[PDB]
């Protein structure tokens, strides 16, 4: 944007998006770790089976 | 016993009356769990008799819906890859796969989808998992000034039921997945915050679908 005020409006959008993304990403990574951990139990059993 | 059930299933009058006994659930469990070709054949024959002989298209749809819900279509697809000494098994599989395919086409109607949303019946009706529906129809949710999205977000605001919540989140996810312009619409409805709350819901089924939905909302500008 062309002015400090329009840049502030864009930055409010960015600050919103980046926080939201990081909150989702934290839970995304945590969920990946649960999925991996569940499978890391199961591989032993599943390999045998 | 199932040969006796198959005899009952032959007559249209009995096909309408016997619905009360929950036959398709029980016989679908047996069809999934039991290996024997005899049992398999006579169940597929009973199912064919139900969808052929029922007095109503609605009774056929009730049976076919119960079969689809009871994972019968997935089992039929596996049974199509399995092979037999009696081709009547394969013809009954093809007949059922076609009649359940028609039931999926009926269920894939945007009017049925709309009716289920308006009725709040967000209960994993197979419409929700119809990739064909979402891929080819997701733009339709914009109708009547975005009325179906207003319902989905209102259900994510109002509902206690984890099924209704998980399903409404799933629907928001598929809406974005097949109509990316819809991200801005969900943001205009505030619905991003509802799925961002429900990713912390007490039920993992809600958490999972809410996580998928917020992830699709957040996937790109």
Residue B12's nearest CA partner among B46, B52, B64 is: B52
Residues 6 or more apart in contact with residue A6 via CB below 8 angstroms: none
Residue A23 and residue B196: Cβ atoms within 8 Å? yes
- Cβ atoms B219, B178 nearer than 8 A: no
Residues 6 or more apart in contact with residue B42 via CB below 8 angstroms: B2, B3, B6
Residues 6 or more apart in contact with residue B202 via CB below 8 angstroms: B162
This PDB structure is determined at a resolution in Å of 3.8
- Cβ atoms B65, B126 nearer than 8 A: yes
Q: Does B218 touch chain A (CB under 8 A)?
A: yes
Residue A31 and residue B211: Cβ atoms within 8 Å? yes
Residue A19 with chain B: CB contacts under 8 Å: none
Strand (E) or helix (H) holding B99:
helix B87-107
Question: Which residues 198-217 on chain B approach chain A with CB closer than 8 angstroms?
Answer: 199, 211, 214-215
Cβ neighbours around A9 below 10 Å, total: 12
Altogether, the residues listed in chain B come to a count of 221
Residue B139's nearest CA partner among B131, B129, B149, B130 is: B149
Contact pairs from chain A to chain B, CB under 8 Å:
17
Q: Which residues of A37-49 are buried (b: 16+ CB within 10 A; e: fewer)?
A: eeeeeeeeeeeee
- Which three-class secondary structure string do you get for B27-42? HHHHHHHCCCHHHHHH
């Amino acid at each position: 944007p062309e002015t400090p005020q329009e840049r502030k409006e864009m930055a409010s959008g960015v600050n919103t998006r980046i926080d939201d993304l990081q909150m989702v990403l934290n839970q995304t990574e945590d969920h990946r770790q649960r999925v991996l951990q569940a499978a890391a139990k199961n591989i032993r059993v599943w390999f045998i089976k | 016993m199932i040969f006796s059930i198959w005899l009952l299933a032959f007559s249209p009058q009995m096909c309408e009356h016997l619905r009360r006994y929950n036959i398709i659930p029980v016989l679908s469990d047996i069809l999934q769990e039991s290996v024997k070709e005899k049992v398999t054949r006579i169940i597929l024959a009973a199912f064919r008799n139900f969808l052929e002989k029922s007095t109503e298209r609605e009774t056929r749809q009730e049976y076919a819906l119960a079969m689809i819900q009871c994972k019968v279509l997935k089992q039929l697809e596996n049974l199509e890859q399995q092979k037999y000494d009696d081709e009547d098994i394969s013809e009954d599989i093809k007949f059922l796969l076609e009649k359940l395919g028609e039931s999926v086409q009926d269920l894939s109607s945007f009017d049925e989808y709309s009716s289920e949303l308006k009725s709040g019946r967000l209960e994993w009706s197979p419409v929700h998992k119809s990739e064909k529906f979402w891929r080819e129809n997701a733009v339709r949710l914009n109708e009547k000034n975005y009325e179906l999205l207003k319902i989905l977000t209102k259900l994510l605001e109002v509902s206690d039921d984890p099924q209704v919540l998980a399903v409404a989140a799933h629907d928001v996810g598929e809406y974005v997945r097949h109509y990316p312009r819809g991200k801005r619409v969900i943001e205009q409805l505030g619905g991003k915050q509802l799925v961002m709350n429900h990713m912390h819901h007490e039920d993992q089924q809600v958490r999972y679908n809410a996580l998928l939905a917020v992830q699709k909302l957040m996937v790109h500008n």
